[PDB]
């Protein structure tokens, strides 16, 4: 049914553009990552991976 | 629960609604834009003739 909007409508009736972000961070290959620079890889020495 | 009953003409059957403007919807009977409920309308030409 019709969902028209009026500028004269007050709070609780104004349009509200909504975007949802759904994440699925799980044990799987990563495709989306943040801006973290990749450093060199070190072996046989204790590090904070 | 509040119920209100009256009679109106054919061209003004849809006039009583939030955001509507005219004679009946403004000077005799106006619904608030946040009104909850609904209207029941039916022809009574057989009786009110």
UniProtKB/Swiss-Prot annotation, chain B:
Region (Integrin-binding motif): 9-11
Primary role: Attaches the virion to the cell membrane by interacting with host receptor, initiating the infection. The major receptor is host ACE2. When S2/S2' has been cleaved, binding to the receptor triggers direct fusion at the cell membrane. When S2/S2' has not been cleaved, binding to the receptor results in internalization of the virus by endocytosis using host TFRC and GRM2 and leading to fusion of the virion membrane with the host endosomal membrane. Alternatively, may use NRP1/NRP2 and integrin as entry receptors.
Self-association and partners: Binds to host ACE2. RBD also interacts with the N-linked glycan on 'Asn-90' of ACE2. Cleavage of S generates a polybasic C-terminal sequence on S1 that binds to host Neuropilin-1 (NRP1) and Neuropilin-2 (NRP2) receptors. Interacts with host integrin alpha-5/beta-1 (ITGA5:ITGB1) and with ACE2 in complex with integrin alpha-5/beta-1 (ITGA5:ITGB1). May interact via cytoplasmic c-terminus with M protein. May interact (via N-terminus) with host bilirubin and biliverdin, thereby preventing antibody binding to the SARS-CoV-2 spike NTD via an allosteric mechanism.
The protein, known as: Spike protein S1
Species this protein is from: Severe acute respiratory syndrome coronavirus 2 (2019-nCoV)
Interval of the full protein contained in this chain: 395 to 443 of 1273
């Amino acid at each position: 049914q019709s969902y028209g909007f009026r500028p004269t409508y007050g709070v609780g009736h104004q349009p509200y553009r909504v975007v949802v972000l759904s994440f699925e961070l799980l044990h799987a290959p990563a495709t989306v990552c943040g801006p973290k620079k990749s450093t060199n890889l070190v072996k046989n020495k204790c590090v904070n991976f | 629960v509040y119920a209100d009953s009256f009679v109106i003409r054919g061209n003004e059957v849809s006039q009583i609604a939030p955001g509507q403007t005219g004679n009946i919807a403004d000077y005799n009977y106006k619904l608030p834009d946040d009104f909850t409920g609904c209207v029941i309308a039916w022809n009574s030409n057989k009786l009110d003739s």
